[PDB]
Amino acid sequence: GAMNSSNYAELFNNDIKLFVDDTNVYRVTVHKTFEGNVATKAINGCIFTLNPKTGHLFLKIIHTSVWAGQKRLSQLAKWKTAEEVSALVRSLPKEEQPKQIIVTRKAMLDPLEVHMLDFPNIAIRPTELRLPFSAAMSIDKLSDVVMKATEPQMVLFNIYDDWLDRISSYTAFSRLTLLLRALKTNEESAKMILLSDPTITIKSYHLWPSFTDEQWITIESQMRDLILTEYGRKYNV
Amino acid sequence: MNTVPFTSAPIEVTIGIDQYSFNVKENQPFHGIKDIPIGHVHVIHFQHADNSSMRYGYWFDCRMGNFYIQYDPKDGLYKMMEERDGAKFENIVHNFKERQMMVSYPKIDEDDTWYNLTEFVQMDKIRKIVRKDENQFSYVDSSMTTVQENELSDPAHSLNYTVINFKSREAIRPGHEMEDFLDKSYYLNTVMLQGIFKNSSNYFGELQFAFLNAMFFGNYGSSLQWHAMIELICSSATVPKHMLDKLDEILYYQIKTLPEQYSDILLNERVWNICLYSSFQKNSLHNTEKIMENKYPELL
Numbered sequence: 091g092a093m094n095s096s097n098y099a100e101l102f103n104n105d106i107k108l109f110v111d112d113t114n115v116y117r118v119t120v121h122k123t124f125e126g127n128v129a130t131k132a133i134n135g136c137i138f139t140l141n142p143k144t145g146h147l148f149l150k151i152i153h154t155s156v157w158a159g160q161k162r163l164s165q166l167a168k169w170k171t172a173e174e175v176s177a178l179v180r181s182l183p184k185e186e187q188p189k190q191i192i193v194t195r196k197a198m199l200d201p202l203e204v205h206m207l208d209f210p211n212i213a214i215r216p217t218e219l220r221l222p223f224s225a226a227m228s229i230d231k232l233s234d235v236v237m238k239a240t241e242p243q244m245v246l247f248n249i250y251d252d253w254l255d256r257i258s259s260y261t262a263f264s265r266l267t268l269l270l271r272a273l274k275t276n277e278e279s280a281k282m283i284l285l286s287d288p289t290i291t292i293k294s295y296h297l298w299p300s301f302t303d304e305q306w307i308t309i310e311s312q313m314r315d316l317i318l319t320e321y322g323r324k325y326n327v
Numbered sequence: 328m329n330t331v332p333f334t335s336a337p338i339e340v341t342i343g344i345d346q347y348s349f350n351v352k353e354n355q356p357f358h359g360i361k362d363i364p365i366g367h368v369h370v371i372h373f374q375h376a377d378n379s380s381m382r383y384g385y386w387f388d389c390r391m392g393n394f395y396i397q398y399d400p401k402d403g404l405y406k407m408m409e410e411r412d413g414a415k416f417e418n419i420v421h422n423f424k425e426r427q428m429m430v431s432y433p434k435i436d437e438d439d440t441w442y443n444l445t446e447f448v449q450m451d452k453i454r455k456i457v458r459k460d461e462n463q464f465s466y467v468d469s470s471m472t473t474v475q476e477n478e479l480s481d482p483a484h485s486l487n488y489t490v491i492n493f494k495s496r497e498a499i500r501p502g503h504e505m506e507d508f509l510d511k512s513y514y515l516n517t518v519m520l521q522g523i524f525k526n527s528s529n530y531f532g533e534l535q536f537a538f539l540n541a542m543f544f545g546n547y548g549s550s551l552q553w554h555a556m557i558e559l560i561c562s563s564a565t566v567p568k569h570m571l572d573k574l575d576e577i578l579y580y581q582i583k584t585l586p587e588q589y590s591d592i593l594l595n596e597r598v599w600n601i602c603l604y605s606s607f608q609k610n611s612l613h614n615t616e617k618i619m620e621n622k623y624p625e626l627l
């Protein structure tokens with residue numbers, strides 16, 4: 091059934107599973123036409139497919155050319171997502187295929203179910219969690235590779251960097267969700283927090299800065315402060 | 328006009344014949360039903376006064392034999408049987424008619440209801456849904472489950488309706504996933520009509536039979552099948568114009584005939600609202616939408 095607080099430790103067991111987030115697949119800027127009407131202009135997008143145990147993010151870039159001459163793009167975006175996830179699974183060796191795919195939005199269920207009919211033993215599940223994966227495009231190196239793409243492209247990233255050398259998946263996922271939640275609630279402040287100290291760098295092969303354990307604790311604290319702060323600034327408390 | 332005689336009525340029972348019903352009292356002198364219109368299937372059905380659990384009954388066609396009803400005190404129900412001795416049967420009926428021990432099938436001359444509910448239903452197809460080949464008639468009751476139901480337990484006692492499942496490889500061409508899920512015309516016209524049913528008459532016959540078993544026996548797997556077959560047409564962008572016009576007629580008479588106090592259970596809110604207001608054929612069911620809105624506006 092649905093993934094929620096009660097069964098949250100299942101994410102880190104040894105059954106392979108993927109989160110699929112489609113929020114950033116179909117992205118548009120809305121603007122005025124010469125005639126004063128309103129029109130959209132699509133920009134490049136991505137499917138966010140994450141194995142939460144390993145940190146493996148299969149980032150499928152969606153190039154704006156895929157929308158050309160198509161109608162009802164918001165609906166197509168979900169079936170396109172499902173087609174690309176199904177293609178990914180088929181490309182993986184059997185022993186690497188997920189036993190469960192968890193979708194962050196319920197409208198992905200039927201599209202993904204239909205595209206995976208060939209895989210009756212893979213469970214397609216929703217979640218009650220309000221996960222912050224939409225904020226993946228606030229991570230500068232992911233944003234940059236999406237916007238530079240001139241064709242469809244799959245980029246392969248470990249979204250935990252080297253954190254699993256020092257911490258468990260549960261802790262790594264909790265850090266990641268806290269970082270993304272912060273970026274989603276106040277991207278400017280979040281990014282100021284992550285970079286304030288010029289001496290802490292991001293390795294060329296990483297996404298996030300190279301914090302010591304102690305520095306990660308300070309960072310994590312600052313991000314929680316931010317999320318409560320904005321929660322007050324937003325709610326006046 | 329034909330006759331279904333009754334050996335006796337030893338337990339108090341409500342007897343149905345098609346859309347008619349009457350109460351018979353324990354050991355009342357009742358010996359059957361006469362003047363049954365030839366040319367249609369029929370269903371004679373039962374609900375015991377003592378245990379309203381289990382409505383059961385028998386589909387039959389008087390052109391296919393002489394059938395009578397006899398109570399079985401061991402199995403505790405009214406059983407249909409075929410009399411092979413023709414002169415025996417005529418003499419029995421004649422004696423019961425002379426003694427006026429039979430109720431008359433009470434059809435109004437203006438009234439085409441039963442024709443309109445059974446237009447496409449044929450005994451030969453019923454017998455393929457209800458497999459019991461040593462009898463010319465078919466038993467159905469409230470509790471019988473369908474083949475599809477058993478897939479999700481006794482096979483010999485199942486209703487073998489054609490399985491429809493919108494999220495199945497049968498319904499969805501590889502590479503046409505979105506197209507075929509959002510517009511079911513492929514599944515309707517190629518898979519079901521051309522492949523399985525051969526023609527729309529057979530499709531409509533199963534749909535009418537499913538409705539009738541839902542209405543008369545409260546058979547839940549049948550109601551599921553009736554709604555599935557409606558939804559498959561309504562959710563196809565491309566439907567022969569003649570099928571749509573006839574579907575509207577079929578449904579119109581089904582909604583007209585449904586008991587008002589059973590609409591809460593027999594009618595699926597999601598299917599009807601989708602079919603009448605959101606689907607491709609939302610504008611193609613004028614008679615059915617008008618009667619639904621004037622008789623069950625609550626459901627919508």
Ligand SMILES: C[C@H](Oc1ccccc1)C(=O)NN
Pocket residue numbers: 146147148246247248
């Ligand atoms: C090689 C390593 O592993 C994968 C990462 C994501 C998906 C599949 C593999 C990595 O971080 N490459 N950039």
